[PDB]
Amino acid sequence: AKLVFFAEAAIIGLMV
Amino acid sequence: AKLVFFAEAAIIGLMV
Amino acid sequence: AKLVFFAEAAIIGLMV
Amino acid sequence: AKLVFFAEAAIIGLMV
């Protein structure tokens, strides 16, 4: 899957 | 701060 | 270069 | 925000 990163603090990597 | 990473999928980076 | 990430687990970041 | 990573060493993650 592709990994998409967000900064929300924490970093969240979510997948496709 | 340092980022500590975990995978559970979601990747989560938490700050120290 | 840009880093493109995938998860297969191993996370793999490839350079563009 | 979304996070974009670059490599040129050291990695840099920039927020969008």
Place this chain on the structure above:
Amino acid sequence: AKLVFFAEAAIIGLMV
């Protein structure tokens, strides 16, 4: 799991 990152170029994140 903990995620451990390596630069080998590519970035490889390996898990515990």
Place this chain on the structure above:
Amino acid sequence: AKLVFFAEAAIIGLMV
């Protein structure tokens, strides 16, 4: 080499 990440914004990954 191992990669360590820091956050202070922007993320920096430094090689060991």
